[PDB]
Amino acid sequence: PRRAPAFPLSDIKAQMLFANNIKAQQASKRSFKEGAIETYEGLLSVDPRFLSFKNELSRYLTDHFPANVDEYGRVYGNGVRTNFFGMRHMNGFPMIPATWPLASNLKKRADADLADGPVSERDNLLFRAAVRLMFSDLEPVPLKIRKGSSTCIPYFSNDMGTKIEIAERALEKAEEAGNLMLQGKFDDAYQLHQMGGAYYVVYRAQSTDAITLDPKTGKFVSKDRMVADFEYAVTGGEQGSLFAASKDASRLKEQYGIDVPDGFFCERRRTAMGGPFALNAPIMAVAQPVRNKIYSKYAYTFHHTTRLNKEEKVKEWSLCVATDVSDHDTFWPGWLRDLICDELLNMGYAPWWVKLFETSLKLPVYVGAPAPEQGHTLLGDPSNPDLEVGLSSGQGATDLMGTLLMSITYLVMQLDHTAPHLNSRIKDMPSACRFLDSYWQGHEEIRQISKSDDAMLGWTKGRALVGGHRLFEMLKEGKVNPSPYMKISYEHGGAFLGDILLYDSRREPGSAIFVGNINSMLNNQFSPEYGVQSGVRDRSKRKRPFPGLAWASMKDTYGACPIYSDVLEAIERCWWNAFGESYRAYREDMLKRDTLELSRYVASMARQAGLAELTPIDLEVLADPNKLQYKWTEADVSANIHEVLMHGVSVEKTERFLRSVMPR
Ligand SMILES: Nc1ncnc2c1ncn2[C@@H]1O[C@H](COP(=O)(O)OP(=O)(O)OP(=O)(O)O)[C@@H](O)[C@H]1O
Description:
By secondary structure, the protein is an alpha+beta fold. The chain contains 25 helices and 21 strands. 42% of the residues lie in helices and 13% in strands. Strands 1-14-13-6-11-4 form a 6-stranded mixed β-sheet, with no helix packed on it. The chain has a 4-stranded antiparallel β-sheet with strand order 15-16-12-17, with helices on both faces. Helix 5 (121-134) runs antiparallel to helix 16 and helix 14 (334-347) runs antiparallel to helix 15 (351-360). The chain binds adenosine-5'-triphosphate (ATP). The PDB classes it as rna polymerase.
C-alpha cells in the first residue's frame, strides 16, 4: 500500500547524508551503546548502595502514601497519583529493542478511527483560523541556538561558531533552496544548501516508567512497551509485527556482571529525531516570533509559568477537565501539515518558505541503532520527500504544530459536546478568527490552557456547563472517543505542565490548588535522563550543567506538595541506611560547589556572589535545560542565565530574512 523505500548505510543515498568528516562518519556508523549513567559525580546509577536506597525508598513511600485519586481522576489528599516504583530502573540500560519509527501513519490513524481531514467546514475554518491568528503580525528576533547542540545531517558539528555560520548562510540561501524545491529539485536543494536529507534518529530515555507490585506473587512487573520491527515500520503496519520490548535486566548480570536486584528493569526508550540544521534555521526564524506572539497576545491559554499562574485561571472555572492524548507525535496528521501550508500560502507567505516548511514535515528518517546489530538504514527517498511519520521531534516548529493541532481539537471537542449554541458564531474565516481570538484570550464560557498534548479544559457558568459535565462523564466511561481527530481520554490524576491539581472535599476548581508533583522531584533527583558528563569542561554544553542548583529551588518547586517534608525525611532516612551519609549534607555540598562554578559562566555574577538574583526557574533550568523545551521558554528565564545556555544570530540578519518571508 506503498512500502517506503529503505536504504542501507552503504547506499549512495544514505552516504550523501554524512559529510566527509570524522564526527559525521561516526554518527552514521554509531553502533548500539549501553552503560550505567553517572547519576552524580562519583555515583553510578547502578551502584549497589544506590539501588538499595532506591528499593527501600520506593517501597516505603508507596506503602505509606498510596495514591489519592477519585473515580474522576481528580487527585486530593496527599497529592500522590501513583506508586513510586517508577524509580526502579537500571538507568543507562535500554529495553531491547527500541522501536523502528513508522514511515507512514495513515493506516495507523485510519484503523484508530481518526479522520483524514477537517470533518466539518467549521472545523476546517477553525484550523485555518488558528493558522491565521498564529502566523500574522510577527516581530523579528534573534535566532537563539542551544549551546553544544548538534548540526545533525550532514555535518554533525557542535561548534557554536560553525553553527552560526551555517544558520546565517541558511537564512541567506533559504529562498533559493525553496524555489529549487518548488521545482522538484530536492537533491539540488540538499547538495547546494544542505536543506533536505533526513532526520537522524536517536533513542532517548524515559528514565522512569510504570511498575507494578502484584500482591499474588510478590514480584514486580514492568509496563510492557510496544515497539515495531523494521517490517512493520516500512509498511505502515501492513506487514511485520508489533511486540513488547524486553525490559528484563537479568542480562546485565551475565553481560556486564552487574548485580541487578529484584524488581529493577531496563529503561523505556523513545525515538527522538535530530533535524538537518540548514533546514531548521529558516524555520526557527519564524517559529520563535510565532511563540512570542501566542505567548503574549494569547497568554491565557498558551503561556504558563508558576503553580499560581495556573491556579489563577482555573480557580475561576466551574468545571475543569484534565485531558490525555494517546501517542501524540505519531498520530499527528499530515493533512494538518498540508492544511497549514495551504493557509500560509493564502495569507501571503513566500511560497519558497512554505515549501521548506512543508518539506521539513515529510522528510526521510535515518535510523541509527535501535538494538545490537540493527539499524543504519535510511527510510524514504530524500530525492522525493514523502514520509508521513507524524511530527518529528526535531523539526523547527514541533511545539507549534502540536499546539495548533490539539488546541483546535479540544475546542472542537467542547463545541461538539457542550456548546452547539456557539456554532453560529463560526460562519466564515472572519467570524472564525474573531471567535478563536476571543476564545484563546479566556473570554468565553468555554476555556482551555494547553501546551500540545497537555491540557486543562474548562467551563464557566452557563449553557455549555451542563454539556461539560456530560462530556467529563463520557470520558470516565471511556467507551467512546470524544474526537474524530486524535484518541482522547481524561488524565488519571490530573495535572498540568508538571503541577498536580489538588482538589479538596468539595471537588471543584475554585477550592482546588496547584502543587508541584513530588514524584517529579524523585524522578529528577534519582533518575536523571543523562549523566553528569564530568568529562565535559564547558558546563554550558552539558545536558545537566549545574545539577546542584536544584537543591536551591526544591522547596519553591515542590514545597506546596502535601507530603513534601515527609518524603525528604524518608529520603534522608533511606540514604543513611544506604550510604551512612546525610543526603541533605551531600546536596548542600553539591549546591555550594555548583553555585561557585556557575559564577565562572555568568559575566554579571560577582566571582562568589550568590544565587541572590536567580528565579527558582533559573535554577531548575540550569540543572536541567530539558525543562526549557517542555515546561518553559526563553521568556521565563532571566536573560543572564539565558546567555549561559544559548547564543544567537544577529537580529539584523533575521529581520532581513523574516521581511522576505512574512506576507506583511
Ligand atoms: N517529565 C516527563 N517524563 C516523561 N514524559 C514526559 C515528561 N514531561 C513531558 N512528557 C511527555 O508526555 C508524553 C506522554 O507520554 P506517553 O506518550 O507515553 O503516553 P502515555 O499516556 O503515558 O501512555 P500510552 O501512550 O502508551 O497510552 C511524552 O511523549 C512526552 O513528550
